[PDB]
Design a protein around this motif. Structure first.
Motif, PDB file in Angstrom:
ATOM      1  N   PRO E  32     -26.957 -57.158 -36.118  1.00 33.12           N
ATOM      2  CA  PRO E  32     -26.230 -56.020 -36.597  1.00 33.12           C
ATOM      3  C   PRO E  32     -27.163 -54.959 -37.051  1.00 33.12           C
ATOM      4  O   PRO E  32     -28.322 -55.315 -37.336  1.00 33.12           O
ATOM      5  N   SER E  33     -26.657 -53.661 -37.127  1.00 29.88           N
ATOM      6  CA  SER E  33     -27.428 -52.547 -37.577  1.00 29.88           C
ATOM      7  C   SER E  33     -27.470 -52.411 -39.013  1.00 29.88           C
ATOM      8  O   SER E  33     -26.823 -51.545 -39.580  1.00 29.88           O
ATOM      9  N   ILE E  34     -28.254 -53.287 -39.676  1.00 27.28           N
ATOM     10  CA  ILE E  34     -28.411 -53.281 -41.102  1.00 27.28           C
ATOM     11  C   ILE E  34     -29.838 -53.265 -41.483  1.00 27.28           C
ATOM     12  O   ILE E  34     -30.645 -53.998 -40.885  1.00 27.28           O
ATOM     13  N   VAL E  35     -30.150 -52.408 -42.398  1.00 25.93           N
ATOM     14  CA  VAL E  35     -31.478 -52.194 -42.910  1.00 25.93           C
ATOM     15  C   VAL E  35     -31.297 -52.658 -44.368  1.00 25.93           C
ATOM     16  O   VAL E  35     -30.311 -52.406 -44.973  1.00 25.93           O
ATOM     17  N   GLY E  36     -32.314 -53.429 -44.858  1.00 26.15           N
ATOM     18  CA  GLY E  36     -32.261 -54.013 -46.189  1.00 26.15           C
ATOM     19  C   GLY E  36     -33.241 -53.189 -47.034  1.00 26.15           C
ATOM     20  O   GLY E  36     -34.160 -52.601 -46.431  1.00 26.15           O
ATOM     21  N   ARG E  37     -33.071 -53.168 -48.406  1.00 26.26           N
ATOM     22  CA  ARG E  37     -33.948 -52.501 -49.265  1.00 26.26           C
ATOM     23  C   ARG E  37     -33.811 -53.392 -50.508  1.00 26.26           C
ATOM     24  O   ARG E  37     -32.694 -53.766 -50.728  1.00 26.26           O
ATOM     25  N   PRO E  38     -34.848 -53.648 -51.335  1.00 23.74           N
ATOM     26  CA  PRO E  38     -34.815 -54.408 -52.524  1.00 23.74           C
ATOM     27  C   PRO E  38     -33.805 -53.868 -53.501  1.00 23.74           C
ATOM     28  O   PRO E  38     -33.377 -52.729 -53.271  1.00 23.74           O
ATOM     29  N   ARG E  39     -33.415 -54.608 -54.568  1.00 28.44           N
ATOM     30  CA  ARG E  39     -32.499 -54.083 -55.534  1.00 28.44           C
ATOM     31  C   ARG E  39     -32.627 -54.902 -56.806  1.00 28.44           C
ATOM     32  O   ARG E  39     -31.826 -54.594 -57.664  1.00 28.44           O
ATOM     33  N   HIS E  40     -33.467 -55.985 -56.795  1.00 32.09           N
ATOM     34  CA  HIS E  40     -33.487 -56.878 -58.005  1.00 32.09           C
ATOM     35  C   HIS E  40     -34.589 -56.327 -58.860  1.00 32.09           C
ATOM     36  O   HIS E  40     -34.623 -56.591 -60.064  1.00 32.09           O
ATOM     37  N   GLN E  41     -35.550 -55.519 -58.310  1.00 33.34           N
ATOM     38  CA  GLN E  41     -36.614 -54.856 -59.040  1.00 33.34           C
ATOM     39  C   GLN E  41     -37.582 -55.861 -59.652  1.00 33.34           C
ATOM     40  O   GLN E  41     -37.852 -56.901 -59.085  1.00 33.34           O
ATOM     41  N   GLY E  48     -40.795 -60.157 -51.674  1.00 34.81           N
ATOM     42  CA  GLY E  48     -39.678 -60.499 -50.817  1.00 34.81           C
ATOM     43  C   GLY E  48     -39.982 -60.637 -49.364  1.00 34.81           C
ATOM     44  O   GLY E  48     -39.253 -61.269 -48.565  1.00 34.81           O
ATOM     45  N   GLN E  49     -41.207 -60.086 -49.020  1.00 36.30           N
ATOM     46  CA  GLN E  49     -42.072 -60.211 -47.858  1.00 36.30           C
ATOM     47  C   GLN E  49     -41.896 -58.964 -47.015  1.00 36.30           C
ATOM     48  O   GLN E  49     -42.688 -58.798 -46.104  1.00 36.30           O
ATOM     49  N   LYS E  50     -40.916 -58.016 -47.370  1.00 41.27           N
ATOM     50  CA  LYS E  50     -40.673 -56.747 -46.812  1.00 41.27           C
ATOM     51  C   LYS E  50     -40.011 -56.069 -47.927  1.00 41.27           C
ATOM     52  O   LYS E  50     -39.725 -56.670 -48.937  1.00 41.27           O
ATOM     53  N   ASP E  51     -39.960 -54.733 -47.756  1.00 45.63           N
ATOM     54  CA  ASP E  51     -39.530 -53.818 -48.773  1.00 45.63           C
ATOM     55  C   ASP E  51     -38.713 -52.909 -47.954  1.00 45.63           C
ATOM     56  O   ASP E  51     -38.044 -52.055 -48.513  1.00 45.63           O
ATOM     57  N   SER E  52     -38.603 -53.135 -46.614  1.00 44.37           N
ATOM     58  CA  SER E  52     -37.740 -52.384 -45.798  1.00 44.37           C
ATOM     59  C   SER E  52     -37.318 -53.312 -44.779  1.00 44.37           C
ATOM     60  O   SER E  52     -37.707 -53.106 -43.596  1.00 44.37           O
ATOM     61  N   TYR E  53     -36.578 -54.359 -45.153  1.00 45.84           N
ATOM     62  CA  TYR E  53     -36.097 -55.457 -44.359  1.00 45.84           C
ATOM     63  C   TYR E  53     -35.293 -54.763 -43.257  1.00 45.84           C
ATOM     64  O   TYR E  53     -34.696 -53.729 -43.471  1.00 45.84           O
ATOM     65  N   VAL E  54     -35.320 -55.284 -41.959  1.00 43.76           N
ATOM     66  CA  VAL E  54     -34.660 -54.539 -40.904  1.00 43.76           C
ATOM     67  C   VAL E  54     -34.225 -55.593 -39.914  1.00 43.76           C
ATOM     68  O   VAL E  54     -34.896 -56.564 -39.610  1.00 43.76           O
ATOM     69  N   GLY E  55     -33.063 -55.361 -39.251  1.00 43.66           N
ATOM     70  CA  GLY E  55     -32.523 -56.154 -38.206  1.00 43.66           C
ATOM     71  C   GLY E  55     -32.217 -57.541 -38.554  1.00 43.66           C
ATOM     72  O   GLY E  55     -31.594 -57.873 -39.640  1.00 43.66           O
ATOM     73  N   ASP E  56     -32.595 -58.533 -37.781  1.00 46.20           N
ATOM     74  CA  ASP E  56     -32.439 -59.958 -37.992  1.00 46.20           C
ATOM     75  C   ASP E  56     -33.055 -60.429 -39.264  1.00 46.20           C
ATOM     76  O   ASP E  56     -32.497 -61.197 -40.047  1.00 46.20           O
TER      77      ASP E  56
END
Ligand SMILES: Nc1ncnc2c1ncn2[C@@H]1O[C@H](COP(=O)(O)OP(=O)(O)O)[C@@H](O)[C@H]1O
Ligand SMILES: Nc1ncnc2c1ncn2[C@@H]1O[C@H](COP(=O)(O)OP(=O)(O)O)[C@@H](O)[C@H]1O
Ligand SMILES: Nc1ncnc2c1ncn2[C@@H]1O[C@H](COP(=O)(O)OP(=O)(O)O)[C@@H](O)[C@H]1O
Ligand SMILES: Nc1ncnc2c1ncn2[C@@H]1O[C@H](COP(=O)(O)OP(=O)(O)O)[C@@H](O)[C@H]1O
Ligand SMILES: Nc1ncnc2c1ncn2[C@@H]1O[C@H](COP(=O)(O)OP(=O)(O)O)[C@@H](O)[C@H]1O
Lengths: 375, 375, 375, 375, 375
Positions: E32-41, E48-56
């Motif tokens: 799916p077309s979802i881009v992740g971004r942290p939020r727990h700070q 988290g191993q990415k800070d701009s989690y993307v795709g799968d």
């Protein structure tokens, strides 16, 4: 000396004026604390060349005198002789001027507060002494053992003390003084010579009574069990030949007077045994401190030199002492001269110069200077 | 050390001062947070060689001292003693200068804002420390374990914390603090014992209560079922002989105090037990975290090592928790030094070296450097 | 009575055995709680009439008797006489059968748990009374005063309690009990008299000490300020003639032992006076409780009948109290029997017919009925 | 009344049961929505004469109680009290029978659908009421302003709503409800007292927390700029003397809690600011309608009464609002009692009689009658 | 690929990045077309191993993320992330350089004029891409079905399209687009659960909602008749055990949410049905076109896969469409990749390679080269 301050060490106690010099381990002058007074009466042409009797000189004659005790109960009743005692110490025994050196005298703990001032007054003002200190009796006995924490059990002539002292001088506890030491045991013996048959009434033989007590009257482990042995005694029964003529058979008597020390019930008093005070003062202190108070049982003073006094504290102490701590008696080979040995220690200190009360201080800070340095 | 910066690893908490060097594997110096003070009283000529006794040197004595407790609730009650503590830690318990090593200390999460600044100031200004950071307590037990997610039930000594943790550390919207750890349990054990028949009034034997707790008060599997066994007490009782001549038989008490842990209602406290808060904090967290929060129930701190402690969180949590996830209590064999061991790992990382606050930075940004770097 | 169920009201505590009936305004039978024992000794022709003296009969003669106190620390230290004390209550001083009426006794807070049953068991099982309850000491003192909310400083007759009370009765928490009492003070006065110059020892004069305390020893507003006025006594020194023939001039003594109540530091005890606890207990409490606790300082007990003690609480209380609430002492005109009066009110309510333990329940449910009712 | 139908007006909200009569402009009964429960425990003889605590009566006592909140999040968790609340409203405040008049209660928008039925059920069937209507919260606030088109920004206790309403009742839009109003800000403050130093844990002081917030915590134009001013504050720093004893210094805190309302990031939530919803709902609507939505910014509810709340919406709104329209805040002088003022308006209508749900309707058209009139 | 130029085949839509190579049979890479971004700070030493989690990679975790969406309404809302989405698609899942392969992408009909050029620009200018064609979306499902002519009801996730397509290239006279597909359905399920009694608003768990919709929610035969079937419940409610132990009984909701697809009226949209627009575009077409349009009601895109969706168009179509012809639904077995399969075909013919734009052609005729071939 003659250019160094160098004090004396005086243990003007109620049993011996144990005087000697600073840094010494022997008191030069040791002589009693009895001042003598006539009673022989009569006319005179030749005379004994005295009429004022003091210390050993007093002691010399007993058959012509009644022996007054200046210090009873640690309270100096007669101050008139006290200058003359000290004149007999400095000038006539130690062979020094009051002016050449200070004088360290003893304060029996919880002393009547007027005496502390009264004494200094006689010294500085009337007998010009550069300085002096009236130390706390018991404390000096701690230093004598080399101990720096413990329970000091000073049973000198007039007063017994159970003083728990900490590394630094203690804050009020169950630090106590009691009259129940040596003189009192002298006065008990005479009671018991009354129901014996032997007669000993007056002052003059009372000192002889004190002698019969000191060198024979072993401290029973238990009176009652040696009481039964009295029936067919062999080692309990011996005759103490009075050394001026008489035999003084002593059976039950021997371990009857020493047992009185710890059990005032034999007098017909309600006072606590000295081993009761031991429990009281130690138990009161924190649980983790009892181990060291019971480890270090300091037993000084001449009264705690009767034969078998040592083994007496091995059962008495364990009675009302737990199984959680070691129990060990500290009793140095000699311990009569205990307050005097301790003052000598202090006089090897130069801080004791500045922990003593100067001549000048008395006039410069009123009479209350006394209680300002002894607290 | 002596060739490189190499910090200390310090758990400046309210239960033990867990000190050691960084890169070390165990806290070499470990000693309770107790400041000693006299109460020997009496005649002192000796000296206990301190007045403000601290740490291990204080711990020696208990019967001569009164025990202050300088960090209570993970809140530094008196910072003046902390200064004497660190002077004893660095110099005399680790025998190193601070003019050489940086320092990793611990912070009980969610403290006063001032503690963080007060701590840094004493270090930079009064020890000239090259750098230091006071890392956040519960988080460190996570690094010890090698875990990267979970629910940390750090029960230190005055404070309990429910820190659900993630590697991008949890925000203040899930993490919680509540006072309910080990010291608080000690003053209840005696509480319910006052009506028993033994006495715990002074501080020094309160410490003894803390001893009795750890090595004989086991956690009840079901309080009520062990309560019923009280009819036939046998397994209930077991005497803890206390060497001052006493024996301490503890019956229902052994598991009565541990149930208080889970039920503050017996204190008079209206708060929730440690097993209730667990739920609360997971239910606050996101849905896509909750199955593994229950997988990863980390139960750290020395309080969570009583015999039977762990097994209670296998039945209580599972109680009102779902039956749809694998419940595994993570409770390592040793979790006393969980914070200390985790604190070594970070002190062996060089990025934690650049994460901590240098000497000079403190002058460049004031006391406020702390909150500018850490939150 | 004999026509109405009419319970007793008995304040079987550390005071007198205050007995009287339910709905009585006074305890008609009042006699102490010291027990007397012989010690005349020798050949005996008659008899001292009584073997064991009980109550008033014991208190009468002390010169032939040695005086036991079967209740010390609120702990019944000897049960055997308690049986004769209740037999002395009902049968010979109120001349009723115990099977006629129920019995209201007092429980001092945090009594030992066996004492609660032990008492009941001899009353019910060995004397039979239709019912009885052992009510909680302080709570009665609240209703006696007529308040319903306050800080009750009930200092009974051996045991002190700082009970903040509400409409609901407080939970274990800021209700506390302490031994720090008149009877303890008695042993501090005799203490200080050693070398000061008086003598008090035995049981028979310990009671006189208690006398010297009550009617002349007033509490200083601050010891140190009346201490210095001692310098020339005028408002200090007065004479207490003691029958035996001897005058007891009391200077500083008047307020020296009375200060020790508020300051157990002068005893040598680590404990805090009762006014420190008053602050402690109130700061422990929630804030929606504190305004009325300072506002209504209820001061109960035979200890707050001490002269110059109420006035002592105008500065002691106001000292570390906020100025954010009014502070005003509620002092009853009489409050020695505050616990008896309050229990009479309870014995005059019918709700109490179900708040007591019936005789038959004791046989019917094991002795844990005691704790089932007074938890 | 007694011959005229004449309703009541009840705003049984999650903050105040704002009840009053029809056509009134003052709600007679205003009392909280907290139902109280004990926690003081103890024995009893006298009692507070209650055991079920409700509204202001509940509020009265806080020191003996834990304050339960029947309505959290607009969901009534406990229905058992709700009859008794309403019995406290009709019988015991307004002094009327449920039978004499209908009752208009409030429905917080998007309510759980079972509650709408559940409530009516308690009324008609169990408390016999001739009629009732559970109006839509927000809508009532529109009529209060006299507005008939706009954007109603009701931030009551539990829920905030951005409701665009048209002349005739609107068709589903971005009409929304969110928990982020007053209670939530109460719960945030306590977070921030945790890192301050002041302690505020429980329910009983949480209400006091809600008080400290309402009357001081001005709404900063920008937090950050008043944050810098915190350094040498003069008007930002003041002490809010707790009115039962304590000073509560509040510096940065004052404009820290109000800013949270619009920026949920300070909590550690991802929720949208209430000024974001404002943009969203208005932009969504046709271009020619935005002019009137931005002209009429209705801001009701007590939460929107903090000082400087008004000037906050003058920059927040202009941010993401164009230059093509006027922007004007509608905020009536009083606006806490906003849903209650609106219902009074409806009750002056006779069509509201026929727009309300009759007694008979419930039995005659099943339980689904409810959702048939409220849509 | 490395043996031929071989493009990718990408059906670059909002519900998935349907990627693969030219010549493949199915998209390998689908996410799916979802881009992740942290939020727990928080602060950190882990990550988290990415800070701009993307795709799968973004979809795997959600509990630490807030989920951005970059294509909504088949309008590529943001290009900044799309670049990075392709940087995870091409490089990291297709494992090859885009500096090395042409690219078959999708054009959603009627995109704004910048979108066609903007997409192409990142491929030619930034990825250097050898050649590419952005074919027209709906059309491809035509070739996938085997059809040549018909009406494609391509409903991907953001965009529903009623495209009548000719043998060749149809003209605008019935081709239409309406945004109403899958993602809209998702925000309605979370909507209708709020009044029911649940919350699942936020992005992280919205994806979970989307999961519930597709493998459960079935379209009714008619809302009204299964609305009447609601009377009985057995065939309605069924618990949707949502991992976390959250049981979700949903009755009318399974077939209440699907109706919203054909009915924007429950949103509050005055837009009409996607099934209404189907008739409209065919009634627009000539009679010698409608017979085969009704023969070929082509139903593609993943939105047209709810169980009960197809069969509904045999009753809906025939309602307001004639009975003189064959209404046949071409409903393929599966149609999630419906656009991907059509591009695979085109990309498996070489004449489409020759119908597409080389790299140099972008510079040689500027960005407008795009609209010259694919308008
Ligand atoms: N060796 C001994 N054994 C037991 N008691 C002795 C012994 N030596 C002295 N005493 C007793 O102790 C008392 C003398 O104490 P002393 O040290 O002279 O006193 P002070 O410290 O008051 O100056 C005398 O009663 C004496 O009998
Ligand atoms: N078996 C145990 N269970 C509970 N407490 C224990 C156990 N063993 C030791 N303790 C003691 O309980 C306390 C735990 O606190 P600790 O974790 O050291 O605290 P902090 O983090 O506050 O420094 C320590 O004082 C420790 O000595
Ligand atoms: N008016 C009075 N002032 C002082 N004490 C008094 C007074 N009346 C009686 N007493 C006697 O002194 C003591 C009063 O205090 P007490 O009741 O013993 O208190 P506590 O609870 O502190 O032991 C009692 O022993 C009592 O007999
Ligand atoms: N004057 C005020 N300024 C700002 N906030 C206030 C003020 N008055 C009330 N509030 C807050 O709003 C909430 C009370 O809302 P209320 O009108 O009682 O609720 P409801 O509509 O749910 O019945 C409380 O949190 C309170 O602190
Ligand atoms: N097999 C299925 N049954 C029902 N709905 C489905 C199915 N598979 C996908 N959907 C739904 O249809 C939409 C996905 O469409 P998709 O083909 O991925 O879109 P796009 O072509 O915009 O990239 C989502 O809302 C998804 O839930």
């Amino acid at each position: 000396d003659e250019d160094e301050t160098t004090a004396l060490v005086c243990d003007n106690g109620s049993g011996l004026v144990k005087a000697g010099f600073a840094g010494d381990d022997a008191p030069r002058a040791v002589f009693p604390s009895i001042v003598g007074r006539p009673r022989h009466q009569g006319v005179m042409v030749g005379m004994g060349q005295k009429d004022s009797y003091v210390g050993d000189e007093a002691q010399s004659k007993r058959g012509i005198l009644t022996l007054k005790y200046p210090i009873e109960h640690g309270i100096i009743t007669n101050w008139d002789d006290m200058e003359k005692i000290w004149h007999h110490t400095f000038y006539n025994e130690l062979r020094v001027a009051p002016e050449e050196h200070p004088t360290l005298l003893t304060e029996a703990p919880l002393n009547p507060k007027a005496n502390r001032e009264k004494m200094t007054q006689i010294m500085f003002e009337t007998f010009n002494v550069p300085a002096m200190y009236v130390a706390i009796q018991a404390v000096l006995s701690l230093y004598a053992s080399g101990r720096t924490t413990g329970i000091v059990l000073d049973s000198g002539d007039g007063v017994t003390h159970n003083v728990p002292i900490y590394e630094g001088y203690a804050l009020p506890h169950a630090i106590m003084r009691l009259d129940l030491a040596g003189r009192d045991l002298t006065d008990y013996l005479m009671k018991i010579l009354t129901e014996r048959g032997y007669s000993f009434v007056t002052t003059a033989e009372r000192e002889i009574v004190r002698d019969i007590k000191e060198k024979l009257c072993y401290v029973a482990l238990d009176f009652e069990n040696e009481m039964a042995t009295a029936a067919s005694s062999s080692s309990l029964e011996k005759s103490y030949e009075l050394p001026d003529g008489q035999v003084i058979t002593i059976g039950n008597e021997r371990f009857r007077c020493p047992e009185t020390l710890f059990q005032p019930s034999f007098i017909g008093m309600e006072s606590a045994g000295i081993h009761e005070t031991t429990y009281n003062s130690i138990m009161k202190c924190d649980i983790d401190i009892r181990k060291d108070l019971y480890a270090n049982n300091v037993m000084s003073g001449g009264t705690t030199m009767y034969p078998g006094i040592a083994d007496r504290m091995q059962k008495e102490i364990t009675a009302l002492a737990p199984s959680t701590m070691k129990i060990k008696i500290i009793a140095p080979p000699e311990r009569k001269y205990s307050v005097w040995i301790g003052g000598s220690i202090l006089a090897s200190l130069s801080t004791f110069q500045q922990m003593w009360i100067t001549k000048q201080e008395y006039d410069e800070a009123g009479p209350s200077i006394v209680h300002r340095k002894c607290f």
